[PDB]
Amino acid sequence: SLIFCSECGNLLESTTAQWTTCDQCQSVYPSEQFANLVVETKSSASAFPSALKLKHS
Amino acid sequence: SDKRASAFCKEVNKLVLSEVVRQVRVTEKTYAIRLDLYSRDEYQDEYGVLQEEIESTFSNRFLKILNRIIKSYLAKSKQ
Amino acid sequence: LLLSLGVDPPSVVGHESGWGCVQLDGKIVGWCTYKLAKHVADVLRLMK
Amino acid sequence: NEYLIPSMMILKALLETSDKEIFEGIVGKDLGNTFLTDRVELMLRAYKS
Amino acid sequence: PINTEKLLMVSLVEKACSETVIHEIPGITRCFSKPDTVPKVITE
Numbered sequence A: 001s002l003i004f005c006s007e008c009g010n011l012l013e014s015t016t017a018q019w020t021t022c023d024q025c026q027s028v029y030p031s032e033q034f035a036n037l038v039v040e041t042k043s044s045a046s047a048f049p050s051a052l053k054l055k056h057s
Numbered sequence B: 001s002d003k004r005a006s007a008f009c010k011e012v013n014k015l016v017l018s019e020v021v022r023q024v025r026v027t028e029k030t031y032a033i034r035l036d037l038y039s040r041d042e043y044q045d046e047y048g049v050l051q052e053e054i055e056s057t058f059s060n061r062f063l064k065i066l067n068r069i070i071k072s073y074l075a076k077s078k079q
Numbered sequence C: 001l002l003l004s005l006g007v008d009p010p011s012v013v014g015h016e017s018g019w020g021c022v023q024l025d026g027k028i029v030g031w032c033t034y035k036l037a038k039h040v041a042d043v044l045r046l047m048k
Numbered sequence D: 001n002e003y004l005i006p007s008m009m010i011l012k013a014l015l016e017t018s019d020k021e022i023f024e025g026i027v028g029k030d031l032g033n034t035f036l037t038d039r040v041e042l043m044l045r046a047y048k049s
Numbered sequence E: 001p002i003n004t005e006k007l008l009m010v011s012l013v014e015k016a017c018s019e020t021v022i023h024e025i026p027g028i029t030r031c032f033s034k035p036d037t038v039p040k041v042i043t044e
């Protein structure tokens, strides 16, 4: 779920702002190749104070 | 009676919105959050707070508190 | 003897889920699957 | 005397590296495990600041 | 806005869950029933 450069290592700025370039290597790319990235962030198990995991365990 | 006794017990006790909720996935892009909730049967098992209660109170106060604490992280990122 | 025993450090940056870490009192020597880890401990102790 | 330096700083200072090597060293696994792949993003932007 | 840094969202919502209460009398919680034929309710 990340976006790096390929020439240098500089982590490119988010495509949302404008076109894609590394601040050091200044390589340019097609912004629409990698647009619409999918991010599905979940929460680890056994982190909420339960009421029912008693009967659910 | 004993049934009404346990009813008052579950009443005066406070449920915390965490104790009802399952895993909370947040799909990103915009910004999108989804909260799982268990079936009404187990819901009234532990409880006896009604669905419309969830709806109204959840929406309003959950909204407000989420707003405030995300403003907190924003203001800390400002620092 | 470690690198002779099937565990090799990745010069190319690579890492997987199953693999764990091996360290010689503060030095990354390589990485290993945990069952191999226990077998390495066993053979090393027997050699000792 | 106490002293307090950010880890990304010292990590880039140590080796002439690519930030991709940094990430794949941190969360080399199971590509894009949500927790670590978000926290490392946040740290990386924060040091890029 | 896009300029805002990434946020630890799942933890934020997990806290907000615990940080909202539906029917809480201000300053009470945890009511329990314990065994004398004079039945009484413990309240924290």
Ligand SMILES: [Zn+2]
Pocket (backbone or CB within 6 Å): A004, A005, A006, A007, A008, A009, A010, A011, A021, A022, A023, A024, A025, A026, A027
């Ligand atoms: Zn670059």
